[model samples]
Target: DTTPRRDAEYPPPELLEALKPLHDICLGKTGVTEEAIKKFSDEEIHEDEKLKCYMNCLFHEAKVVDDNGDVHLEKLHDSLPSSMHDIAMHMGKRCLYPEGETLCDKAFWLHKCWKQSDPKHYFLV
Candidate 1:
């Protein structure tokens, strides 16, 4: 049953569904759209404090990582429905990293990875 959910929506539909309200809160009511976020470079996002803060809010609120910078898998699995855990965990693995990197640093990398993975659908984190 651990087969890849290839037909699953990018980022998984359940995870995207959960993020809608959070994105509105973090990136403002307008939120980060595929169109709005398409043009930002990783470097540009890194230097922009507001954008960094917005991403920080999403990552923190989603419990994407804990204080020790480990992937908060328990919280993440709890947030999404059962079926989507595999997909969500896959993406989380892509985002999680070892120590020494700040939240912003990891955020930038996650954004870049998302964009590169499926630019047509996902925003830059």
Candidate 2:
């Protein structure tokens, strides 16, 4: 007996057979002499550019909201470099404290942390 179908009434084997030629094209036994690794360097460069755009967009959009510190922490929590949350939260407190130290007061410490995690962002600052 056949295994239970993902869509019970239908099976995909027939469609797979119909598309065998297309699938065969990807087998690399016929066309495409180049290997998959050949595409890696170019794709890596493209992805790096795409990731830069994503970060820039995130930073700019983050500035639009009024409560930057909390909103920034939330946004950072949604994705990579999560360690940024603590830094952003701490920075937010400092940024908001009228009687307390300003962000400039912690500039050296901030720069050191940023340099450790990502020196590029500090340069962007």
Candidate 3:
């Protein structure tokens, strides 16, 4: 088993770079304002409707999963800091798929699991 303690080269730079256009699209489309940064930072996600849908937009538009809402575990794992990669894989494999009346809720619920699984390491994509 490998553990990454302090190496910050994690969370591939390419992935962060890849988020640029998607963020603009979602942020602009969703009308999300303020520092709509951390989705799983708080126990309660009291942001707003736009923030919820903004995550949905990121998930869907980014192809993190197909329309079916299944997580692409590798992609999800890679998004996290290296310290949490294995845990992410475990969470992605173990957790039940999320269900939502709206697509936004789907992203929200999946992120909620991320928060539960590793709150300290998880961050917004």
Candidate 4:
């Protein structure tokens, strides 16, 4: 089971840096508007289509999965600092679905799981 918690501290700086390009890509290609952060912070329902596209773009850009669409758990785990390792592991376990037949599918599913698990933190930022 996933136990989501808030640490009251910023996540790893490397993690943030690595995600910047992906985030920018999301803003450029996906429907992620400038209001995304506000919407996320407010706990409003996200636009599912936009969210899915954003996740897919991130995973693809970051090579979080292999050519077969299976998640590269080791790569993902090592990419983050130790501070976020456990959380990443938990989210990976809880979010990877057998039905996720593609990288995009798995990414979107994981993104959805993350949001549901921790409503207080906006990981995308």
Pick the winner on lDDT between candidates 1 and 2: 1
Clashes of each: 0, 0, 0, 0
- Model 2, residue 25: what's the lDDT? 38
Off by over 4 Å in 1: 1-14, 29-34, 38-50, 68-71, 92-95, 98-101, 114-125
Q: Please give, for residues 37-80, the per-residue lDDT of candidate 4 as tens digits.
A: 44553455465666656667766677767787565768777867
Q: What is the C-alpha RMSD of each candidate to the true structure, in Å?
A: 6.4, 18.9, 4.8, 3.7
- Using all chains and alpha carbons, the TM-scores for the candidates as numbered come to 0.51, 0.21, 0.69, 0.70
Instruction: Report how far residue 77 has shifted in candidate 1, in Å.
Output: 4.1
Q: Provide the overall lDDT of each model, using Cα atoms, as 2-decimal numbers.
A: 0.54, 0.32, 0.64, 0.63
Q: Per-residue lDDT tens digits of candidate 3, residues 1-125? A: 12222225545566567888998888888888637554334334464667778888887677767556655656655665675567567655545677778878777777767656655544565
- Model 4, residue 71: distance off in Å is 3.3
For model 1, give the 10-residue run with minimal summed lDDT.
Answer: 38-47
Q: What is the C-alpha local distance difference test score of candidate 1?
A: 0.54
